[PDB]
Amino acid sequence: GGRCQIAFNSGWLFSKNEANAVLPDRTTAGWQAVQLPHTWNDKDVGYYRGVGWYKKRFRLVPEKGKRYFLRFEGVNQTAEVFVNGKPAGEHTGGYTAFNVDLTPFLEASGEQYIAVKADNSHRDDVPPLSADFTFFGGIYRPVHLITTGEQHFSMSDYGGPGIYITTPRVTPHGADVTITYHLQNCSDAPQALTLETVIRKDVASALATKNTAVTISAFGDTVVTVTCSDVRNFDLWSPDHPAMYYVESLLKQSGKRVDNLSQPLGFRWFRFDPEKGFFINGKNIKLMGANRHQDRIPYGNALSNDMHRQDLSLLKEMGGNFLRNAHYPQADEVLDQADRLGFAVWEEIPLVNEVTVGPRHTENTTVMLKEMIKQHYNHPSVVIWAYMNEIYWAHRYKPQEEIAGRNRATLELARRLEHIVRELDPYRYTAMAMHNDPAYEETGLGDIPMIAGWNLYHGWYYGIYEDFGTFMDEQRRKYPKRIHLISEYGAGSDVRLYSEKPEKFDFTVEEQTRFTRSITTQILDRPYIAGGALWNLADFSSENNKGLVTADRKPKDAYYLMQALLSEKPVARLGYPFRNRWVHAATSPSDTLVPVRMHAFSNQKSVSLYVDNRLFGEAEVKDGMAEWEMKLIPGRHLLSLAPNSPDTPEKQIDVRLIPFRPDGKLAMNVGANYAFIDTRTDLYWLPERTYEKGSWGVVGGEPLYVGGKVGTKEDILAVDEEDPLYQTMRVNPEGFGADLPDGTYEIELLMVDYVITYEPGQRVFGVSVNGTSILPEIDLGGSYGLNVPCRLTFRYTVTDNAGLSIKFHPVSGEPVLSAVRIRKVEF
Amino acid sequence: GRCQIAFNSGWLFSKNEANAVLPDRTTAGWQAVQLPHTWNDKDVLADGRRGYYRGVGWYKKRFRLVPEKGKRYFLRFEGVNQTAEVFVNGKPAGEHTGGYTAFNVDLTPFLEASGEQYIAVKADNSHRDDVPPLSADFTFFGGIYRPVHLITTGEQHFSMSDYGGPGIYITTPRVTPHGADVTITYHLQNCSDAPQALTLETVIRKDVASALATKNTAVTISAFGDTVVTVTCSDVRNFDLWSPDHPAMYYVESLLKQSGKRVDNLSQPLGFRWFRFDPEKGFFINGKNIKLMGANRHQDRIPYGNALSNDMHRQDLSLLKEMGGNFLRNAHYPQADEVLDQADRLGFAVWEEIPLVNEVTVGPRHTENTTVMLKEMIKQHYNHPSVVIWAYMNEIYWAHRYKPQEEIAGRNRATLELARRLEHIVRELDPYRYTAMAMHNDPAYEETGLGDIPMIAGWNLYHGWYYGIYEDFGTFMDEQRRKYPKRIHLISEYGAGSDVRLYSEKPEKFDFTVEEQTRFTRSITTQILDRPYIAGGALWNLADFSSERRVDATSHINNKGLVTADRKPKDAYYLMQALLSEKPVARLGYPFRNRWVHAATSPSDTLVPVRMHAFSNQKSVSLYVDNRLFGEAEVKDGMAEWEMKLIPGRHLLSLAPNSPDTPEKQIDVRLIPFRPDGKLAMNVGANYAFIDTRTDLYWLPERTYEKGSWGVVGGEPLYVGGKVGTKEDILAVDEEDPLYQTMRVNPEGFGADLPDGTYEIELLMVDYVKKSRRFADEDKGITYEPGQRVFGVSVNGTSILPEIDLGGSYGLNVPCRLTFRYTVTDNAGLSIKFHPVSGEPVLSAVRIRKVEF
Ligand SMILES: [Ca+2]
Ligand SMILES: [Ca+2]
Ligand SMILES: [Ca+2]
Ligand SMILES: [Ca+2]
Ligand code: NA
Ligand code: NA
C-alpha cells in the first residue's frame, strides 16, 4: 500500500493560561480536554485574542521507509508546532492548510509528544486586519496524520496537493488534460519510479490512462508534466449538471505503490461577457446564490463536516447556483460539496477594510494567495479568485495624512496579486468586491481585476431600493467593457419582529423580504449583471441578523422568497415560518375582526389561500409572491394552499382582538410600527398607537430617528432579548392614557437614553399617575447612563371612573418612552 | 401612603472586586446589569470546566432619592443567594443569611439629604456549614437573582422588621358555608419622636367596588414605639369558598392613617377554606374528597440560571394547570411571591419547605439559622390560601453514607432535636396548616422515628428507576399503610429522566429514552390513583433543571422534567394531562420526533415498522394515516397504541380524517436496505436511536452483523452498576455523550457488504471507568491507563492503525473518533477488524458514508 491518512483530532489538551508547553509535560490538571475542531472563542462572543496552547501525547513507531506528516486544515491565526521538544513547523494565516513533517523528530520508542502554540491576536502584517466577522482563535479545523513512502507527491508546495490539473482545451466531444506533478524523494539513494495517471468516473471505469517513468536523485525533487490528449466520452460540468470525475495518481517503486492521491476533475469551459454575463459550456446562465460564513453560533467556527454539507445543501435547495466563500478560503469539504452539488464558486483571501504599507504585509499576503490557489486549484466549481474586499472601508477612520500613501500601497499590492493569479491560473477570472464609496472611482482600483464586484445595500444602509438600479446602470454606462457582478446584497431580520408597515432598518421579517425581492428583481432584469450573492446565508457572529436562515439554519421568509425566484421546480408555500400569532388593537368600538395580511412564495401564475380548508381567494403571483388581505374572527384558524391536502399539514394561527375600550385582562412597543413577539414566554408587544378618547395609547411625542433610520441601533446594555423594544422610542411624549375600569393594574414603563457614558442633568423628568407622583425624578443619562435601560414597574389602583392617565413632567431635556405594559391584577 | 417601585435598573456587577463599600464612580471592569441577576447562568452548563464559581460578587449603583420630611424609605430584596451585606453611602445598612427568603433594609438613616446616593451589595454563594442548603441535587446560583423594590412609607407604618413578612397576618380560625371569622394581626411601627394616635381601616374585598366586611380601629403608639394589634371580623357572609377547582379569591385592604391622612397601605391575599388529611381516604377541602396530583417545580430555567422574570413564573404554573394539576410542591425552598399569587389565582394546593437537604450540621449556629429561615418562610407566605403544607427537611439522612462514622450518632441526635424544634415552631406560628417531611427509600427513618414528628409522611420513591421494579411501589406503600394505619401518606416525589433525542422500541431503565419515562410515569401514577390512602403525588419534576454536579446523558442537567428547560412538553406531560384532566383529551405522542429509520432485517423487507401512541382519557381513539383510517384502539391508562408498517417516504398522522382544526403530524420514514450502498450510522452497544439535532443525524440502534448486510461483529454491550453503558461525563464532547457512553466490549470488528467504491469510515471509541461512583465530577486531570487497552485496526487486511493505546494516549472518558477513507475493490465488501494486544477493544458507534474518492 501507499498513502495512509487518518484523523488526528482526538486526545488533545488545551490551556489559555499556559506560559510554555514546548517540552514534554505529562501534567493535565487545569488543562481542558478537547477534540478538534476547537476554538476558544465559541462562547466569550471583547473576545479573547491571544496565545493558546494545545498538547497531546500519542503512540507512533516509525517504520523503515515511511514518512509521517501532520496536515492542519486551519489554525487561526499563527501556529508554532513542537514535536518532542523541537520546533517542527510554523504557519501564519488563519484560513489555509499547512503540513508538518514529523519524521525528523519522532522517538524510536514510539512515545511522542506534540504541542501547538496558537495565537489570534492582532498583527499589522497579517490580514484580516479588521472586519465585521469574529476572528475565532484555535485549531478550528481538523488535523490529519498522513503516512507515505519516502518517495511521494510533495508536502511542501504551499500546502497544496502537489498535483495540479489543467484542462487547456475542452469541447463537448473531447478535451486535453494536463497534470503537473511535484515529486519528492526523501531517501539517500537515487530512485527509479513509475507514475500511473488515471482519469476515472469511478473505480470500475477509466477514461484515460497514462504511465510515466521518472528517476529522482538522492534527497531530490522534480516536477513532471503529464498530458492526456483528446480524452473523450465525458459529461460536461455545470451547476445544473455537476458531472464529476477524478484523477487517480499512483506513485510506484518496484511495482509496490509508495504514494497515492486522488484529485477532483470537472470538464468545462466558461467566460464572462460585459453585455450578457456568464457563459459555461456555451450556455448563458445567471449566477444567483449566496455568501457563506464558516461559523455557527454557539460553536464559533469549529464546525463539523456535517455542518458544511448541511449549509451547502440549504443553498442548493434554494435554487442557488453560485457560492462566494465570504472573505477567506474555506474547508476542502465546502469545495468538494460545491463540485458535487453544482455551484460556481468565488473564493478570496481576507484582505479586508484596509492595507498595511510595507513589504512584510506584501509578503504574507502573497504567500496566502499562493496557498489558496494551489490548495484549491483542482476544484472545477471555482471560477473566480479574488483578493481584496472593501479595501477602502476603513479610510473614514484613518488619519487623513495617511490616505494618499494607503491608496498607493493598495494599488501596488493589487497589481502584484493580480499578476500572481494570472500566472498561477490562466483559466479562471480575477475579481474584487467594492462598495459604495468614491475612493474606487478616484484611485482606478476597479480597473485591475477582470471582474468588478459591488457590495450594495440600497434601501438598507443608504438610499431606497431603486437607487440600486440607478447605481449599476451608471457603472455599466461608465464602463461598458467591465464585467459587473453583485458580490454582496442583503438586509437584516429578527424573526421576532413583524410590521404591516415595514421601513428601512427596522429588522422586521417583512422589510428583509421586500428588500430581497426588489434587488433580486433588479438584478434579474439586467443581463449585464453577471450575477449576485446574498449577504449572508445564515445569521452569524460579528463585530448579526443578515441571514436568509437563522443561526441554527432554519429558513426565514426571505429564503423561501429566493427559492420561488430561483428554483426550476414548482414552488408554492406559505410565508411566516416563525410566526403563528396576530394581535390587533381595535380602531373603533364596533370592530369585531382581526386584519391578517398573508403571503405565499410561488413561481406559479397564481395561488389560492384556504382558511379552515375553505377557499378564501385566488391571487396573482408577481415577483415570487402572492398576497391576501383577511379579516378573521378571533380564534384559531388553519391556513393552507390546497383544501384538505393529502401530504402538507396546515399552518395553525392564533389571532386576537384587543377591544377599543381596554380592561387589561396590553403591551405596546412605543416609537415603532412593528410588533415584537418575545419568544421566551410568548409575549406579544403591539406596534405603537396614539391615544384617543375612550381607548388607550401613547400621548404626544415624536418617533426617534437616528441618521435617518427609525430608533437607535446601539447595543442596549444589560438586556439581551429586549433590544428592539428599547431601541425605538418616542421623544418628548406627554404621557400615556388608557380608559380602564376601576381596579388595580401593574404598569411598566421602559425607557433608555440614546447616544459607560454618563450625561448628568441632561434628560431628567418625573412620572405621575392620576395626579399621584410616582417617580419625582428619573435622571436617565445621569444615574443610569447612555444605553442603560430603566424599567419602571409598579402597581396603581384606578378609582372614581378616572381611567388611567400617566404623565411625564419635564425637568431637563425631553422625556423618552420605549414601551408600555399594563396588566390587571387582583390587588 | 405606601409607594413601591422596582429598583432593578442601573446596577453594576463585578466578580473580581475586593471592596466597593465606599462611594466610587469608576466603571471600568464592571458589568452593567438589570436585576434579577445571577453570575452562574453560563458556567453551570457544559463549558469544559466542571464546577461553577461560588464566592463573593459585588453590586453597586448610584441613584437619585431626595428624602422627604415624614417619609421612610426601604429596599426589599426578594432574594439574594446566599448571604448579603448592604452598604449605603459607605455605611453598613443591613445583612441577610439564606438565599430563598426576602429581606428589608431601611435606607433612611444613611441617605444624603441632597439626593445623590450610592449603594453597594456584597453577595456570596460560598458553602457555609451553618447555612442550608448544605448539599443537594440542584445548583446554588449566586447573586441578586430576584427583583429589588424601593418602598416609601410614612413615619408610622406596617412593620418592615418582622422577618421580612408583611406585618399583616390573616387567619381564618372558623370557616363555615354560612359564615367565617377572619382575624388580622398587625405589627405597627412609629419612627416619630412623638406619640401618635392612628386609625387603621380593615376591609375584606372581592374588588375595589365590593366590601364583605369593614373595620375602623384606633391605635396609639408611643414615640419610637411599636405595637401588635389584632382585628377580628366576625360572621363574614357572602363569600365563595377557595379550592384548586374553584379558586375564589379575596383580599384584605389595610389603611393606616394619621389625622385621616394615609401613612401606609398594604393589601394582602385572603381565601376561605377548611381542609383536612385523612389516613384512609386522603385530602378533603370544603368537605369534598379530592386527589392531589401535580408536580414539583424548581425556580431555574436554562440558560438563564435562576434569574427568572415574573412572566416565567406565570408560564410555569399555567403549564401545570393545563396539565390538570391541582397540587404544587415548590421543590426544596420557598419561592417568589409571584409563584404563590399564581397558585392562589390558578388553584393549586401548595407544599412549601426550607432547604434542609441531605444532612444537618451539629450546633447552635445551624439551629439558629434554620429556625430563622423557618420563621421567614412561614411569615412571608402566611396569607396565601393555596399553602396547605409547611415542611422543613428533605431526605435528611441521604448524606450519611458519605460521612465519617464517628459523626453519625451526633448527626442523628442533631437531626432529631432540630426536627422537634422546627415542628414546634410551625405549630405555634400556624395552627391552621399541616406539617410534612419528604423521606426516601432508606431504613434510617424507620429506625429513628423521625417520620412520626410531622403530621404528614412524604415519600420520594423511584421504583423501577433507582431500585426494584414499578410494582414494588405499590408493595412499598401498601406495607407503609399496613404498618402505620394512623399516618397520612403522600408521594412528594417520583419521576424518571429522559432526553428528547433518545428513542427505543425496547426501552430500559437509565437509557434516558422518552419511552422509558412515559412507561415509568404511567405505572406509578396509576398505582397512586388506585390508592385512596395516598392523599397525593407530585411528579419530579415539572421541567428539566440545572444540577451542575450531574453526569449521565446530559451533564449538569437533571432531565426528569415533564417539559424541557425551555418549557416544551415531553410525552410524559401529555400522559399526565390524559390521566388528570377533566376536559376530553386525545392527542398524538412524540412531540420531539418526526423521523423513523429502520435497517431491513431481510432482503425482502420493504416496510418501516412504526409504533405510534396517543394520550387520551376517552374510551378509544382512531389513528389515520394520510387521512385514511388505520384502526381504532382501546385506551388503557391514558394511552392508545398502534403498530404500523409503512412505505418509506413522508406520511401524515392524525386522530380524525381531514381535521378542520388540527394540523396533522408529518413524519419521515426510511428503510436502509438489507445490503447497503452507503448512499449508515449505528449506535453500538445500545437499543436506542440517537437523533443528533444539530444536523438531523440519526444513529440507528445496534445490529449484529450477518452475512450479506452490515453490523457489529462479536462483543458484549457494556453494563456498569446495573445500568447500560457508562454514565460518566464523556470529556471534550457535549451533544454526543449518550452515543459514546454505550459500547460493545471486546468486539471483533465491524462488517458491511458494500459495493466496490470509496467510503469514509468513522469509529467512535472511549475507555471507560469500570466501577460506578457517586460523584464523577471531581477528577483532577485525566486518568491514563497505559498498556491496558491496546489494539490495532485493519480493513480488508490493510493496516489502518498499527496500534492505539486507548487508556494510554487518550485516557478514561476521553473520546477517540477514528476517521478515514478506504476504497473497496474486487467485490470484497468492507471488513474492519480489531487486533488485540492488551485487554479488549471497545466500540461505541460506527458511521460509513460513500464518497466519490
Ligand atoms: Ca389536514
Ligand atoms: Ca443588548
Ligand atoms: Ca463550569
Ligand atoms: Ca461531555
Ligand atoms: Na420601542
Ligand atoms: Na453507543
Residue numbers in the entry:
A (entry chain A): 28 to 72, 79 to 576, 586 to 707, 712 to 801, 814 to 885
B (entry chain B): 29 to 707, 712 to 885
Give sentences from the paper.
We determined the x-ray crystal structures of TlGUS L1, TfGUS mL1, and TfGUS L2 to 1.6, 2.2, and 2.3 Å resolution, respectively. Only the pathogenic T. forsythia species is found to contain an L2 GUS gene in the oral microbiome. We found that all mL1, L2, and NTL GUS enzymes from the oral microbiome contained a predicted N-terminal signaling sequence, indicating that these GUS enzymes have the potential to engage with polysaccharide substrates in the extracellular milieu. In addition, we found that while TlGUS L1 and TfGUS L2 exhibited less than 1% processing activity for any compound regardless of pH, TfGUS mL1 showed essentially 100% processing of all substrates independent of pH. Despite T. forsythia having an asaccharolytic physiology, our data demonstrate that it encodes multiple GUS proteins active against small and large glucuronide-containing substrates.
